Copies of this chain bind each other. A is one copy, B any other.
């Protein structure tokens, strides 16, 4: 409803001043999340970052505030400005390893130098590093769980495989970044260079499907892992020295197939 969303827009404007007046050490206030992206819906939160000059500060504030006859959830992450700026070097936790553009809309800054540095459309994060070993380890756990008839073990370790395989596909696919978790699913399903079965198998292993069995899930995991390992260049800086050597020696393949 237009009145609700106009109301939220007004709440956002009011909150900028409220945050300034509460945090004397604030140097910048940025809108984040759904309302920063322009894709919010009824239950979306209003998210702010409040960057302060006070070192090693890290608090999380929550409000629940009336907008007409509704209540909206407001969150503010209060953080040392420098620590906030530095986390651009760390991969996001929510993108299945994909590099991200964490949407930022600067609402207020204390001075010209700060405002210039922080008036950007997003903060970037790099891709997570490939985890070949942990992928293979998880496939072994799936095999063990099948052998002992432990369906939950198969489902759980298949989720591990599904969380790690995108780290392996990222380097061999065209570059893609995402701004939120739901889009990470879209981007990964869209990868053009993937092993046989991938799109369907990835959802099966991640446990984002209507129906599956332990047998069908293990088979999906097998296809993904066997498939992706065949598609990687033997680059020791990308995959690890031991891993690249084991691949060239034919040992990784022999281990998987024995």
Chain B, Cβ-Cβ closest to A69: B258
Q: How far is the CB of A98 from chain B (nearest CB, A)?
A: 14
Given A41-B147, A61-B242, decide whether A185 and B152 contact each other with a Cβ distance below 8 A: yes
Query: Does A200 touch B at the CB level, under 8 Å?
Result: no
**Interface size, A (range):** 35 or more
User: C-beta contact mask, A164-181 vs B, less than 8 Å → 1, else 0?
Assistant: 000000000000000001
A190 interface residue, CB < 8 Å from B?
Answer: no
Does B140 contact A207, Cβ atoms closer than 8 Å? Answer: no
Contact between chains at A141 and B258 (CB < 8 Å): no
C-alpha gap A206/B206 in the complex (Å): 9
- Contact assessment for B71 and A136 in the assembled complex, using a CB-CB cutoff below 8 Å: no
User: Is A45 part of the contact surface with B, judged by Cβ < 8 Å?
Assistant: yes
Chain B residues near A242: list those with CB within 8 A. 61-63
Flag if A62 contacts B133 (CB, 8 Å): yes
| B207 pairs with A133, CB closer than 8 A | no
A:47-96 near B, CB below 8 Å? 60-64, 70-71, 73, 75
Known pairs A133-B75, A242-B62; A143 contacts B255 (CB<8 A): no
CB contact under 8 A between A243 and B45, given known A155-B208, A208-B207: no
**Sample of 14 further A-B pairs with CB below 8 A, known A43-B140, A43-B143, A75-B137:** A41-B144, A41-B148, A44-B144, A45-B140, A64-B246, A64-B254, A70-B258, A71-B254, A71-B255, A73-B140, A73-B255, A155-B208, A156-B185, A159-B208
A residues lining the B interface (CB < 8 Å): 41-45, 60-64, 70-71, 73, 75, 133, 136-137, 139-141, 143-144, 147-148, 150-153, 155-156, 159, 181-182, 185, 203, 206-213, 240, 242-243, 246, 251-252, 254-255, 258
13 A-B residue pairs with CB within 8 Å: A41-B147, A42-B147, A43-B139, A44-B140, A45-B140, A63-B246, A64-B255, A71-B254, A75-B137, A150-B182, A155-B208, A156-B182, A156-B185
